[PDB]
Design an enzyme around this catalytic site. Structure first.
Site, PDB file in Angstrom:
ATOM      1  N   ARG D 182       0.810  -1.219   0.000  1.00 53.87           N
ATOM      2  CA  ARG D 182       0.000   0.000   0.000  1.00 53.87           C
ATOM      3  C   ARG D 182       0.845   1.273   0.000  1.00 53.87           C
ATOM      4  O   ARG D 182       0.384   2.295  -0.491  1.00 53.87           O
ATOM      5  CB  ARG D 182      -0.916   0.052   1.229  1.00 53.87           C
ATOM      6  CG  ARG D 182      -2.196  -0.724   1.056  1.00 53.87           C
ATOM      7  CD  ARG D 182      -3.019  -0.904   2.324  1.00 53.87           C
ATOM      8  NE  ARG D 182      -3.423   0.368   2.923  1.00 53.87           N
ATOM      9  CZ  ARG D 182      -4.441   0.529   3.766  1.00 53.87           C
ATOM     10  NH1 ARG D 182      -5.208  -0.505   4.106  1.00 53.87           N
ATOM     11  NH2 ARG D 182      -4.713   1.729   4.262  1.00 53.87           N
ATOM     12  N   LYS D 197      10.410   0.089   7.081  1.00 51.31           N
ATOM     13  CA  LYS D 197      10.628  -0.531   8.376  1.00 51.31           C
ATOM     14  C   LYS D 197       9.357  -1.334   8.709  1.00 51.31           C
ATOM     15  O   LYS D 197       8.352  -0.762   9.154  1.00 51.31           O
ATOM     16  CB  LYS D 197      10.957   0.449   9.496  1.00 51.31           C
ATOM     17  CG  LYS D 197      11.448  -0.297  10.766  1.00 51.31           C
ATOM     18  CD  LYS D 197      11.145   0.369  12.041  1.00 51.31           C
ATOM     19  CE  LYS D 197       9.730   0.255  12.515  1.00 51.31           C
ATOM     20  NZ  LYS D 197       9.303  -1.151  12.729  1.00 51.31           N
ATOM     21  N   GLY D 255       2.066   7.588  15.901  1.00 49.95           N
ATOM     22  CA  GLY D 255       1.738   8.460  14.773  1.00 49.95           C
ATOM     23  C   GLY D 255       1.869   9.935  15.076  1.00 49.95           C
ATOM     24  O   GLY D 255       2.471  10.692  14.307  1.00 49.95           O
ATOM     25  N   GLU D 272      -2.154   6.583   9.048  1.00 55.25           N
ATOM     26  CA  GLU D 272      -3.396   5.826   9.222  1.00 55.25           C
ATOM     27  C   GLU D 272      -3.297   5.256  10.615  1.00 55.25           C
ATOM     28  O   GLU D 272      -2.433   4.432  10.872  1.00 55.25           O
ATOM     29  CB  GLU D 272      -3.577   4.755   8.171  1.00 55.25           C
ATOM     30  CG  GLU D 272      -4.891   4.008   8.419  1.00 55.25           C
ATOM     31  CD  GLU D 272      -5.363   3.116   7.300  1.00 55.25           C
ATOM     32  OE1 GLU D 272      -5.514   1.902   7.561  1.00 55.25           O
ATOM     33  OE2 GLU D 272      -5.576   3.626   6.173  1.00 55.25           O
ATOM     34  N   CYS D 306      -7.868  -2.280  11.606  1.00 54.36           N
ATOM     35  CA  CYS D 306      -8.321  -0.959  12.066  1.00 54.36           C
ATOM     36  C   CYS D 306      -9.616  -0.539  11.438  1.00 54.36           C
ATOM     37  O   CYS D 306     -10.171   0.436  11.916  1.00 54.36           O
ATOM     38  CB  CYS D 306      -7.267   0.129  11.967  1.00 54.36           C
ATOM     39  SG  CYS D 306      -6.585   0.650  13.579  1.00 54.36           S
ATOM     40  N   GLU D 403     -10.219   1.295  21.120  1.00 49.61           N
ATOM     41  CA  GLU D 403     -10.091   0.217  20.131  1.00 49.61           C
ATOM     42  C   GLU D 403      -9.704  -1.089  20.820  1.00 49.61           C
ATOM     43  O   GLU D 403      -8.648  -1.150  21.436  1.00 49.61           O
ATOM     44  CB  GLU D 403      -9.033   0.644  19.091  1.00 49.61           C
ATOM     45  CG  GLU D 403      -8.801  -0.298  17.943  1.00 49.61           C
ATOM     46  CD  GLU D 403      -7.830   0.317  16.955  1.00 49.61           C
ATOM     47  OE1 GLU D 403      -6.736   0.741  17.381  1.00 49.61           O
ATOM     48  OE2 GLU D 403      -8.173   0.401  15.756  1.00 49.61           O
TER      49      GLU D 403
END
Lengths: 502, 502, 505, 505
Positions: D182, D197, D255, D272, D306, D403
């Site tokens: 992706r 990585k 992130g 993301e 996710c 989550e």
């Protein structure tokens, strides 16, 4: 004596083509390779040798109607496949065209005459349209348009037009087929193809490879013979929703007129009379190499070929001298022989038209700088020619020569050359050679042609839109825009829609 | 007695229109308002009263040739203006159309008959095309395409096609003019407009406002009279590069046939026979309101009007009962009278066609649920009608009625209604009413029509592409795609290009 | 009321200030929701005319609390503004465009008064700044979604585009209107609301623009204007979860700090930072085009633009002819008050800007540069600097390495095309670059090779609302202007519809 | 050589590991330029099979120095790779796509071995991950520039698009191939080079993918793979001026740190991050479609995606019927080793993941949730957890706020449409959301109202390479997949040509 007495001069090449499954002597209608209903045939001849290669069916109205019915029956399932599924199948066809390019190139040489390097180049170029539209099939995007009505939502969907009738000429026996068939199939259309009766073998080999690739029967159909009767069946059918044609202006205009009674979508590529302007500040070597390639490719038998060259006063003598030297290096002969850069003209009618243009020019004051006569090989080979001191009263200036004859017209100002270039009803290709950025952009914008080569004599590519303005055509082939010709837009308006929550 | 004896019934409205500079009795050719060369004229009549409004010129071939010459002379300067400059001028025209909307709406009522609310709505809608393409003029984007040749660079430019000939019908006397003229002018084209001889006054008022807005003389020209002679001059001219037509299928097909000899670009919007499918799970009030609006707007005189309604078995009785009650609230009369929702049919030929469709349906078993006869007002007023028990053998099912008659066809399955809807050569508008997401999307995708209203009876908008599939048309009007009809693409290939530095 | 009374400080250009104050365009308060406000503690900062030193007025010195109230007002207004049709927002934005154009002469004078540029440039800025309002009023109706061919027969795929939410916009002093409209117009067009912080050096034009936005029918809370403690206002913008995007134009150091601070709430960020524009004049350049182009590209706004030419590389064969003609062109420039006709150079914004210009000139001269024209403070005093040309410049000089933001043009001699291109690309800047050549191959090659967001080829004035403006490398993120400018203010949404049926035959 | 020798540790699935090792897809070194390398100090980290606890192999434990060498190799390779035609890069990327597909069964088994998912899901991941390579091989030739109508008659305006430069890509463990492709496929297609990585938990699939990229003819240095000290590698990526873009998929906390660190070199950043997907089942939903959809959307990869459904809002009228049919559907799931046929639930990646699942279940039960199915560790032990449904869930529970990344489905009863939508939009997450309704107006309204980057409407499986994937609010920046995915790896350049002539008549 004892031994093989072949009817043709290139039996080894024909045997290899046949062993590879690429030599066909029948048309294709649905799931069958067929003869004409009465078994009548027509010969396909090698233009370099005069020898018959094979006979093919002489079909007419009835066979065309059966091909249309097969394409119409196949449309329902083919159009309902996902774009991804059609893309996979079209890529398999692309791979088979490339895998067989050397043999397919030789088949083009045999029936059309062009040098083998040009014929293999045509397979790579023709197959590139198959790859391009296999990728573009998945990029038929619809739209969501902001609605000025709070209670409505607006969409645009794009769907295949339906059965397509495709009519192709003899000068690019593969690329003219794939330029029409690849976008049609990618969109979800089915096709009935009528190749030129002069060069049908390459279309039939291409259709064999389409079947090997998994293209279902009826999606591609190939008919040939009575071109008028086949064309009338295509025009009279209400299932044929679109017609695509490449060839002469006179035939194109008749098809466009005939298409009116069923309101068919029509795309045409017709005659071109390409002017080429060599300005004083042109890079001389680029101009000479560019004009040589743009004029003499396929012995001048392309509708993007340079038909008339306008050369500015300050560079005229230097250009004429270097251009004559470049043209003298061209070599005519059989396209299967190495080192050959000029093939024969397709037939005696083509040769007579070339001789008519040269005689008319010489009778009105043109000076023969190189060539100007039939080649020593005879048949339909013509010497690469340059005519100096040409003028706007000559037949070669007014009409498409479709032969290896280059007339030179001297001019003084940029404005004079541009107005002279734009003073016709043709609008296919035009060319210009200048090193100056302002002049180059200005000439490209000013020329009333669908395509312009700026410091370039070879402009053909599958990624760009090809076609004409004025009486040279309708629609475009190649590029993302080529696929739109095979689609119908649909606006969907959803009503009684609610306001979003906070 | 002493006092004003007017020839017409709405002298006050005509006087106001004239005081505002919107009442014209001459055509427009270049920088002059003109009569026909022989001074001959034709009357324009008010369909609600029978009274002559004014006479206008009866022009032919010669005047059309002069209008084409004026448009061709104006093209050079108009096409060379920046897009921003044309955009500013077109926005000034849009503002003047909106400023004068109430008077322009009344002029539409006088010559065409529709209720004033619909006529003012038409000015807002027609003017919206002028605004839309004033904005879109600055968004004619060209492309830079990645070149597969390292030494070449590839561009796509888009340029105006040239002089456009536009032919318009009588049912939307302003919007049909602006739908064609606004994109043409935005692209940089000039126009020769032939409005319907039945409703030319609104086109002439629109052209007066275009001149007031600063549109140079010759950019817009308006001619009328001998439609055949004017059309032949448009077709025979090589300067006319495009023709756009909206009207009957028979005339459209002849123009498309005639366009072939000069390879003109052609865009057409022709007959429609819109099916409307009311499914069992439709929201009844939305369906009744949607079908009432979609059928009876302009007394059924629109080519997107609902022509036949397929109603599913489970909802048939409830729909027929509620739909009859809604249709009974419609009121016929003079469009300048408040509360009026149905105007007269344009002329006696239109009335005779409506009566022919109703008689044919009743002779084949149709049941008159409401109306079914000439209105008590006489002239060309017809009672809003509903015909139950209609079938696929009836003239109203096969052909466009263009009148306030709604036939109901009962059906059982979704597949039956869709196949029945798709079983014609028409492909303009179609409608469907269902509350289910899967069924709604499926029906929208399955319908072979250029436009689909889903839970919506009024789909017209300048932001979406309007036009037909099959024999209903070529090209689209409205949306970003509408401008492409007035442009020619040009591929420019730059050669001898260098590799970028590190 | 007697002329001797001192409530209004007497000064020059009082007639212009009275005309602006009569038009409702001379403001001394910020705008938060439906109120024009002072700071909560009544503190202020003065706005001075850089050409005269006189006070125009004071504006509030706001901080964290006022910024939070402006964000709350923008967040409350977002729901209704974003739910309007695109056509409705377009009509209102066009009304704002028309009012900016109707008031352009007075607004141009207000820019002259607070920023100093010549009046012709200031009226030009109003036309250019207002052009973004018109452009995005039109583009609001062209936020197209997509329908993507689905590889799954039972699914249908859509892409919708929706406004990001509340936007915080921070603008610099060199284009007091255009920098505001470049950010506000696309945000409003998309359906966002804004909290604007103009430069405390030039806030009056932003407040006049906001007054005209209210007159145009832009609802209260959709546009809010705060100023004062830039650090505290910025921190309130960064700490707020309702602020979904930040757009900044200004110095690289401040930009980098905002980008770092944006990380903790994952804000969308667009930045336009320092530029150090090289200009390459090749041997085959058209001399008159190069001289005129470099004059316009360098000395516009007295060199105070981030697309201004900062260094000129001149090829060996054309060097002497270019230096001679360029010096003659630069000698025609005339410094003074921007409201005086005939003036083509205004003062530098403040003493810090003047000191930086003097630091660059002294560093260049100490390393061998030759002063061909100017090279000193103008006889007018204050922050006026003489238009200068420095010959024999080199890559060791401060003016070569850093943005001068002043009317100083250094000339670097070079031999080959490849040398000039590699030298042009050897920095962390990537905003604008320029090249002058008559050759088609060389022109296209240099345009492709230059690692800059914008390239002028035979052009010194490249600014326009129709094209994407912004930087590569450390010169920025995102673009302003063009269709692409609106994407910065939108969020994409993919909608996948399942259990879909096959079409009927 | 005797079977008793211990150099290769004996274990289960040795036959599969030998087949992978024979194919050249079982790697134990990183890739830097033209060499497969160890860490400079020879340090390593073990890769274990989550279903058996056995060691598959060790990979290097690299840090700052190796990351700098990988960046230098990518920077050196960029010049030649970016100068190739788009067609040439397209051909090479298609060769990589073909090799991924040719090796899909072995690559699927490698994903099972290191990540644990069932083999059918792992082979599906190879097909999906490889689809991005094909998609961007095609899209490489469609990087179109523009010609914009100029409002100046003497100027012409172009927009070119060029690769951003070296890209640093950081990927998570839950999709060991698709997360790599992706990011890598669009970067390479645009003309960028990469330093990848992968997660230290699942690096073997990234190394197998890089081996196949080399076999496809991707030049050395265009793709580089490093792993070990994630913090040190990330810091080298952030400190490098040659790294012009960073792309990250993973936790919100990491992130946010990367986005903050990117500020000092003004890097382009795409992220993301965490998702907390609500799913709304309305009264008029088609029950079978909702049950099948929620089963697929929740329990795919044992809930470790996710876009997985994290909370289900069920309308009052359909609650009992949905809970009963959903429990029956969930009871058919079967946990175990992913290489065993018939298994539909793999183990959770590690003990930390299991502890988080147990923390969410205990918190829900302590606040009134009712366990309808599961609610405990599976009898297989290790990190296998029973597929669970919790009825009577509420907005005070940890599973509602955060989550879970596990096979736990909480059901929240609701009364009105507006209540469910406002509840769905009341968070800082904005990745995926789902809705089930048969009504056209309600379906479109809910899709427009949900403040999420992706919405499944009557669909539980929305993943595809053709559509833009990413988040709003704190769930991310940028998009992956679709035509828009390539824009993240490009820089726009506006070129303005001046001194242009008017066309001739």
């Amino acid at each position: 004596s004892s031994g093989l007495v072949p009817r043709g001069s290139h039996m080894g090449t024909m045997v290899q083509l046949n062993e590879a499954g690429l030599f066909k002597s029948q048309g294709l209608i649905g799931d069958k390779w067929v003869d004409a209903e009465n078994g009548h045939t027509l010969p396909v001849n090698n233009p370099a040798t005069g020898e018959i290669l094979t006979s093919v069916p002489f079909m007419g109205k009835r066979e065309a109607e059966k091909a249309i019915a097969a394409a119409s029956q196949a449309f329902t399932s083919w159009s309902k496949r996902t774009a991804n599924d059609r893309s996979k199948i079209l890529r398999q066809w692309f791979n088979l065209l490339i895998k067989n390019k050397d043999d397919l190139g030789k088949l083009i040489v045999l029936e059309q005459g062009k040098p083998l390097a040009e014929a293999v180049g045509e397979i790579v170029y023709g197959a590139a349209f198959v790859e391009y539209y296999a990728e573009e099939a998945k990029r038929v995007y619809g739209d969501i348009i902001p609605s000025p009505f709070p209670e409505k939502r607006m969409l645009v969907m794009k769907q295949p037009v339906g059965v397509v009738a495709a009519i192709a000429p003899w000068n690019f026996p593969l690329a003219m087929i794939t330029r029409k068939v690849a976008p049609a199939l990618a969109a979800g259309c089915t096709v009935v193809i009528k190749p030129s009766e002069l060069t049908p073998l390459t279309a039939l080999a291409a259709a064999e490879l389409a079947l090997q690739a998994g293209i279902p029967p009826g999606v591609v159909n190939v008919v040939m013979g009575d071109a008028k009767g086949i064309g009338d069946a295509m025009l009279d059918s209400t299932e044929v929703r679109k017609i695509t044609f490449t060839g002469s202006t006179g035939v194109g205009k008749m098809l466009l007129a005939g298409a009116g009674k069923t309101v068919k979508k029509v795309s045409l590529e017709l005659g071109g009379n390409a002017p080429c302007i060599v300005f004083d500040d042109a890079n001389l070597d680029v101009a000479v190499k560019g004009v040589l390639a743009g004029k003499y490719r396929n012995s001048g038998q392309t509708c993007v070929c340079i038909n008339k060259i306008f050369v500015q006063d300050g560079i005229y003598d230097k250009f004429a001298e270097a251009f004559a030297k470049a043209v003298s290096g061209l070599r005519a002969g059989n396209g299967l022989e190495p080192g050959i850069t000029q093939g024969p003209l397709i037939n005696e009618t083509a040769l007579e038209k070339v001789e008519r243009h040269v005689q008319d020019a010489v009778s009105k004051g043109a000076k023969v700088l190189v060539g100007g006569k039939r080649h020593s090989l005879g048949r339909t080979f013509y010497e690469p020619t340059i005519l100096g001191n040409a003028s706007d009263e000559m037949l070669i200036f007014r009409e498409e020569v479709f032969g290896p004859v280059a007339p030179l017209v001297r001019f003084n100002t940029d404005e004079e050359a541009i107005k002279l270039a734009n003073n016709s009803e043709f609008g296919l290709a035009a060319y210009a050679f200048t090193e100056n950025i302002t002049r180059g952009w200005r000439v490209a914008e000013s020329l009333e042609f669908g395509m312009v080569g700026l410091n370039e004599g070879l402009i053909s590519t599958e990624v760009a839109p090809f076609g004409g303005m004025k009486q040279s055509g309708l629609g475009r082939e190649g590029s993302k825009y080529g696929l739109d010709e095979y689609l119908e837009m649909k606006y969907v308006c959803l009503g009684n829609m609610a306001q979003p929550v906070g």
